[PDB]
């Protein structure tokens, strides 16, 4: 580990600096080093980990989609042959994306999930596992594609089961998990009705619990509820 000689606290400090500087690759490398110290992560630290890799993979996904679109157009009737370069470069970006996903999944498996006993931490990590298998599924076309989709589904489902038992319906982690699992249903599993049902039920159950919340918690929960509504509007 390149970060093996740096103090845990220094890695966390530098991850925060990297965030401020919009240096997300560095942020992710610092947080990987912090995870590899072997200690559990606090709430704030889990968030730094997730933000770093979300931004790295998000950029890769956006690039992959641009390149995939160019490649699709090149294979249309009447398109002039331009050689192997578009496919090669799309493949390069894809391989790098898969590498990042494998790295995140590796951190979760060694050993974040197994040491997470509180509902909030376990759900957070299982959501991440679902998300990164979902990103692998976005680019999958071979014989393991079904197994990748099922891996995402299984992680999301375990997270959902815990969240429903252990967390209030307004809890932000619970809400964000549901938002993302609903997108999984719509975009990956070809289950738009399940996606819509999950988003609606999640929204409605959260609405009914808002009365219990402080002003600050209300703000957080309603922001995420609006994302559920936005997706519902897109889909209906």
């Amino acid at each position: 580990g390149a970060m093996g000689s740096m103090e845990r606290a220094s890695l966390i400090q530098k991850a925060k600096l990297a965030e401020q500087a919009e240096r997300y690759e560095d942020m992710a490398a610092f947080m990987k080093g912090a995870v590899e110290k072997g200690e559990e992560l606090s709430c704030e630290e889990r968030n730094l980990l997730s933000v770093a890799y979300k931004n790295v993979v998000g950029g890769q996904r956006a690039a992959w989609r641009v390149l995939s679109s160019i490649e699709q157009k090149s294979n249309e009737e009447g398109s002039e042959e331009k050689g192997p370069e578009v496919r090669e470069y799309r493949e390069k970006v894809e391989t790098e994306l898969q590498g990042v996903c494998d790295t995140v999944l590796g951190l979760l498996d060694s050993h974040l999930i197994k040491e997470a006993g509180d509902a909030e931490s376990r759900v957070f990590y299982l959501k991440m596992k679902g998300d990164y298998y979902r990103y692998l599924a976005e680019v999958a076309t071979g014989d393991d594609k079904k197994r990748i989709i099922d891996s995402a589904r299984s992680a999301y489902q375990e997270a959902m089961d815990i969240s429903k038992k252990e967390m209030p319906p307004t809890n932000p982690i619970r809400l964000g998990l549901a938002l993302n699992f609903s997108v999984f249903h719509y975009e990956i599993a070809n289950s738009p009705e399940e996606a819509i049902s999950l988003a609606k039920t999640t929204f409605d159950e959260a609405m009914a619990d808002l009365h219990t919340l402080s002003e600050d918690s209300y703000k957080d929960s309603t922001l995420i509820m609006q994302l559920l509504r936005d997706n519902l509007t897109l889909w209906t």
Partner: peptide
């Protein structure tokens, strides 16, 4: 694309 967090 739809919203995720």
């Amino acid at each position: 694309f739809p919203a995720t967090v």
